[PDB]
């Protein structure tokens, strides 16, 4: 009956959970990026050391200001973008809680049941006539 035809919530609820999942996924991806960034930094540092080391060796044989420029530019860019994305993730998560409001049980459920019941009454009246 119309009472048992109120399982549309189970799809609507689905949508709800789906959003959360997607939201979480966003967070997940962000974390990964952040970690990569740190790893990137590590590699960068190592490279410098290696370069430093080779300089020593090269100096042993005797007796740049643009690679670092773009390195620092893109590093500050990634840091600013990670800050913006973390703020956006906080905002998205908080907006999702302010959306898990209403429904998911007896408020938005009986409303659907009653509307379906009215639709049924109208259809029965039309068929009878």
């Amino acid at each position: 009956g119309s009472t048992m035809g109120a399982a549309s919530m189970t799809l609507t609820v689905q949508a709800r959970q789906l959003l959360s999942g997607i939201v979480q996924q966003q967070n997940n991806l962000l974390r990964a990026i952040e970690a990569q960034q740190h790893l990137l930094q590590l590699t960068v540092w190592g490279i410098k050391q290696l370069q430093a080391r080779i300089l020593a060796v090269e100096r042993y044989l005797k007796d740049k200001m643009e690679w670092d420029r773009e390195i620092n530019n893109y590093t500050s860019l990634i840091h600013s973008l990670i800050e913006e994305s973390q703020n956006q993730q906080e905002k998205n998560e908080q907006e999702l809680l302010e959306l898990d409001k209403w429904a998911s049980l007896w408020n938005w459920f009986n409303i659907t049941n009653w509307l379906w019941y009215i639709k049924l009454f109208i259809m029965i009246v039309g068929g009878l006539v």
Epitope: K101, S104, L105, N107
Partner: nanobody, 121 residues
Framework: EVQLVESGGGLVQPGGSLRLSCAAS????????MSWYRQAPGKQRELVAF???????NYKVSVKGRFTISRDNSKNMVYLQMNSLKPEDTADYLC????????????????WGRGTQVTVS
């Protein structure tokens, strides 16, 4: 119209526990949602947790597993148990009564409190 009063605030060492209490004037058994927010100096008013008239509880991502919202309809009370507090949890905490329009409420209920301060340092 219901009126909300916060209590139970104070300062606590990082890792301590507190129990905030929103005392509502009227019976909140018919209030659709009772929510705990927090607001820090210079930051936004963050929704921390919320319970419904049917007991549906949900929390914030940074506080899930260490905050616990609960309700006592006999005392008309909404409690918020705070555990393992971080310095990030320092804010003036508010409680809000929300009620969308239904069959008994002609006007939507939107009541704020004056908040109790919670410091973790």
């Amino acid at each position: 119209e219901v009126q909300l009063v916060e209590s139970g605030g104070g300062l606590v060492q990082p890792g301590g526990s507190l129990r905030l209490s929103c005392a509502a004037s009227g019976s909140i058994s018919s209030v659709d949602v009772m929510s705990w927010y927090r607001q820090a100096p210079g930051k936004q008013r963050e929704l921390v947790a919320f319970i419904t008239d049917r007991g549906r509880t949900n929390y914030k991502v940074s506080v899930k597993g260490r905050f616990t919202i609960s309700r006592d309809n006999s005392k008309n009370m909404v409690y918020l148990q705070m555990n393992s507090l971080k310095p990030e949890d320092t804010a003036d905490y508010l409680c809000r009564a929300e009620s969308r329009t239904s069959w008994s409420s002609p006007s939507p209920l939107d009541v704020w409190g004056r908040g109790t301060q919670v410091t973790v340092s």
